Structure of Aspartate aminotransferase:
Amino acid sequence: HVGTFENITAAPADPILGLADLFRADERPGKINLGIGAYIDETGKFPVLTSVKKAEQYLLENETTKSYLGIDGIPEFGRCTQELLFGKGSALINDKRARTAQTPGGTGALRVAADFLAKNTSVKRVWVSNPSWPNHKSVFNSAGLEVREYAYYDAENHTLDFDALINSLNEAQAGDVVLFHGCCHNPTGIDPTLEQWQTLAQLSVEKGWLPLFDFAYQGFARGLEEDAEGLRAFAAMHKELIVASSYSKNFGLYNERVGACTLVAADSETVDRAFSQMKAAIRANYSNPPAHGASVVATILSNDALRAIWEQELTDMRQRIQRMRQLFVNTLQEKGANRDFSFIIKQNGMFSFSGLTKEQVLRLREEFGVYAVASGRVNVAGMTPDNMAPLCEAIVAVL
Amino acid sequence: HVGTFENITAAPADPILGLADLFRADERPGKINLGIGAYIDETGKFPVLTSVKKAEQYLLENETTKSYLGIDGIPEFGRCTQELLFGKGSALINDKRARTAQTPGGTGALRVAADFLAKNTSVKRVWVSNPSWPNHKSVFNSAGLEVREYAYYDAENHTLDFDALINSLNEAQAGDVVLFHGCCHNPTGIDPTLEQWQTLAQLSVEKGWLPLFDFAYQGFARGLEEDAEGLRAFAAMHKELIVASSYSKNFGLYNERVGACTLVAADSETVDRAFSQMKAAIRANYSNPPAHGASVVATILSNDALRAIWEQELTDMRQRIQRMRQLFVNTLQEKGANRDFSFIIKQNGMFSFSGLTKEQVLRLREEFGVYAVASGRVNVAGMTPDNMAPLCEAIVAVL
Ligand SMILES: *Cc1c(COP(=O)(O)O)cnc(C)c1O
Ligand SMILES: *Cc1c(COP(=O)(O)O)cnc(C)c1O
């Protein structure tokens, strides 16, 4: 009998997560990792937050069971999630229009949404930005959903091409999903203004789209509440929406797989009925979600003192990234770049969408041991005072 | 615009995990939880193992990052998993024929395996025993695979009907998946003997089946090595197989979501090609797996002294369950059951597949606050010296 695996086609390594192994294997002295979006401190450590360590110490001392969570996870984690997303005292919360499942990361939340929609609704098409995080298409395609692209970035002026965005969504139909990044658009770092979010919310209602927000960076653009303004503008008028949120970056809990899928419907009866099918989709995937990271988040968000410690740590990360963004632009100039990189200062979040080409990114790896994503996305949150001059010399060398 | 969620049909609660909510809500102080397969201690707590607490205390004091694991998880976890499954020094390991991905539980490993097969092979169907764990059908169907049943249990005589099993599997075609429970068949507790496993392995090779092992209870039948004899009989002569294993029960790590998907192929080239697509399927599901529980497992298994503490705790659980199984049969007779319940002694694992009908299980809940699964499956590992008399009085009253 011919093996079942004989006809398999190899898949390439992931263009983002595969960079870790490539970086590790490189033997060039002075290599620099700017790939996966993870926060580094000034010393080059990707740290555990102090608030997280304190929560983990509390759990070690107080947990007396590991019994399965419910399919939707820890109830306090869901309550705190809805407050972060919508605001305490939101009508969505008071009217019991939203239900939240704790999931294994924001990716898990996107997947649970995809499987839920594919099995239980008439959704067949999801619109994502050009460019976007590459795993969006993979997640929705896994469920058999068609993924189209809408225009988003003006690569010439390094701004949002809002007129092309509007034009390109003209053919998005009622009952199609349109996916928006809540803040810190990945990879461009360019987000709608509040006025643009309000225009998009109105258009979405008029055209009957189902909005899906990917919210992986709440707190990294301007602050927790400011970064939710776009989502909240959508929440103010829509009957239905979905939010896939992540605590990987804003709590530094990447490998503990901490996210949430929040389903909003017109009323409590409808959301509860829909959520019962979301739970069935979870049960048939990974059964129930991992407790450790979500329990850390719930422990921090439900305790005023620990929460204040965490929100200061998040503000401190944002401040350091902003300082690196400015130092990067200045050092590129110092080291002889003639391209104007001032547009990088306007980008929000952890990255610089640099305009470097695929060929330049590959040269930076092969000739200089500097690792970025082939889309030109560079992790500013991985830069330090000690690595800045060599990384900028390398970039100037490939321009 | 009519809402996308307006016409969704509600899903029922899960027949196993839904018992957690029903039990927790019941106000009667005498309620007894015999539902989900979790181990209780004599004080009535579902505990954290001492080895696990020790490992968690080490992780708390020594972890310096939460950076993403690889898509396939912690390397030492995969090594230790292959050794448990196949034996240190197995030819499968020496010949580099096996690749392991850490997953969010055994369920996550089943779904990853099913998505991998549906999307990269000609597999269309999985053969599952009658009866089996109810979530098997849901996992496989959610990945797009048809599920067919093969004969297994003789419910009137409470035994494995091996001739009926082999006869029904003649309908399985080359390139179909056949699911086997590695040990502690859920729900019946009846496993093939070693000779029967060897017979099944030879037939599977001759017929071209792709074996998938669900191995959630290694250590709960007879012991770690003995419980893997059936899997190892398959590993001796198969070109290809898949193992979905779980550490939820044998480490008591239920809510940390700790399992593995292991692929075996004819040679290193083939298994590495296949595994590249398994990684792609993971990436598009939950991205990468949760570190905390798997870190605990790797810490325990890779330290000789801590491993010995854990293996004694696992033996102590298995022995207490055996004592409860023997006490349950006697107590049923003292409480007035006339019928033969000796078949319960022959069952391996956490459960007793009791022969109670759906109506009897519902009466147990409603009238006595005793919670079992509607199939008649009862969690012997939830029995204690203190709850045995009331649970047996309730059972006799509904017979
Ligand atoms: C970080 C990221 C994610 C996924 O996050 P996880 O929590 O690691 O699964 C999802 N979407 C975007 C846009 C991201 O940047
Ligand atoms: C325990 C169980 C599972 C699920 O295990 P998790 O690790 O919690 O996902 C899978 N299969 C069987 C047969 C089980 O009993």
Q: What stands out?
A: Chain A touches chain B through 90 residues (CB under 8 Å). The first strand of chain A starts at residue 32 and ends at 33. Chain A has 15 helices and 13 strands.
